[PDB]
Structure formats: structure tokens, C-alpha cells
């Protein structure tokens, strides 16, 4: 379904807007999203995959994609780790799914967040990319209360083509990133 609200926002408003502050000589120099990634540090449930099939299908609902497990590399008995028996979930959503996802998060997820106040602006890692954590996961649409057996939040990475994050700072605000400023 190559169409949606935010998908347009970037073109018929946000694309030229960027050219206003930086004036790119070329049509591609103008930064774009192209990679949204999500990861859950469930080393907590690394014991039994029992409490894991759930957070997977839960994650799948809110993202549309079928998540992919991530094994342990090292081994640390300091907290029950060895080989690859452990666990973590990772899902790389791009294309349309990325937009239909970012619409929910910026227009539904964030606002219903317990005592929200604005995304931390410092979370820009030199190059144009943003990261942020969420203690809960029920702050998503298609998640009912009686469904969650345990509150397990996570964090999402978003990747732009922006070289410097100075530019990136702008591209996010223009899409709908409520920065704490």
C-alpha cells in the first residue's frame, strides 16, 4: 500500500522545507528516512522462551513485520549468559511499513505515554540518527490491557541520510518529533 499521511508530509511540505535552511544543490543531498529498527533486551526472559513467543507476536502487531530473534555472542556467567541460548528481538522495518509505523508512534504512541514531556534532543549520535527508549509497550494502538502478561518496553533506532545531525535535528521536527528542546 504505497500511500499514507506522513509518507506525503515529507514530500509536499517537509522536502522543500529542508531546502529552505540548507539549499541542497542536488535532489538527493536532502536527507531522508530509510531505516527504522526495533530491539527488545529480554535477557530477562533469557531463561525460558516460554515468555517470548508473546513479546514476539506483540511486537509483530505494532510493527506489521514478523520479528527476528537475536542470539548472544559472548557468554557471561555474571548474569547467566553463554553461547547463543540467550535472546533478544530485532525487527528492521523500512519502506511503507516504516511510515505506517512512524505515524502511530508520533501521533498516538508518544501522547498516550505516561507523563510524556518531549523526546530528549541530546540523543543524536554525531551522524544523523536518533535513538530513544520506551519502558512500556502498551502505549501502542492494537495492544489491549488484558493481552499483556508483563510490561516489557524496548527502544527504536531511526536512520536518515543526513551526514551531520544538525540537519537531522530539523528533518525529525518537520515530520512530527515533539522534542523536549
Amino acid at each position: 500500500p504505497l500511500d499514507l499521511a506522513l509518507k506525503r508530509k515529507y514530500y509536499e511540505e517537509v522536502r522543500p522545507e529542508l531546502i529552505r535552511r540548507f539549499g541542497y544543490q542536488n535532489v538527493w543531498e536532502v536527507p531522508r528516512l530509510e531505516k527504522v529498527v526495533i530491539n527488545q533486551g529480554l535477557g530477562e526472559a533469557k531463561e525460558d522462551a516460554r515468555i517470548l513467543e508473546k513479546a514476539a507476536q506483540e511486537l509483530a502487531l505494532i510493527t506489521g513485520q514478523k520479528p527476528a530473534v537475536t542470539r548472544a555472542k559472548k557468554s557471561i556467567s555474571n548474569f547467566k549468559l553463554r553461547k547463543g541460548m540467550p535472546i533478544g528481538l530485532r525487527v528492521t522495518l523500512r519502506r511503507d511499513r516504516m511510515w505506517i509505523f512512524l505515524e502511530k508512534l508520533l501521533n498516538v504512541a508518544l501522547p498516550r505515554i505516561r507523563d510524556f514531556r518531549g523526546l530528549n534532543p541530546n540523543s543524536f549520535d554525531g551522524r544523523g540518527n536518533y535513538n530513544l527508549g520506551l519502558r512500556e509497550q502498551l502505549i501502542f494502538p492494537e495492544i489491549t490491557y488484558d493481552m499483556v502478561d508483563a510490561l516489557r518496553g524496548m527502544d527504536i533506532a531511526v536512520v536518515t541520510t543526513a551526514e551531520t545531525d544538525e540537519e537531522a535535528r530539523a528533518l525529525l521536527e518537520l515530520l512530527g518529533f515533539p522534542f523536549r528542546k
Binding site: 500500500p1 506489521g64 508520533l106 498516538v108 501522547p111 498516550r112 492494537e142 515533539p178
Partner: peptide
Amino acid sequence: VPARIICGCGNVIETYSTKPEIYVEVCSKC
């Protein structure tokens, strides 16, 4: 499949995700 998000304050959003029913309470328009 398409779905309608009935915000807790008008602004019935519409996008794509399983289960069209959406009792969203409050949103970005508040």
C-alpha cells in the same frame, strides 16, 4: 488492512494495521 483510530478527542485517524477497531484515548491533537 486499513483501520480507523478513534482518538479520545475527535480526529478519527486512518492508516494501516491489524484490527480496525481502535479505542485510542487522547492523542497528538491534545
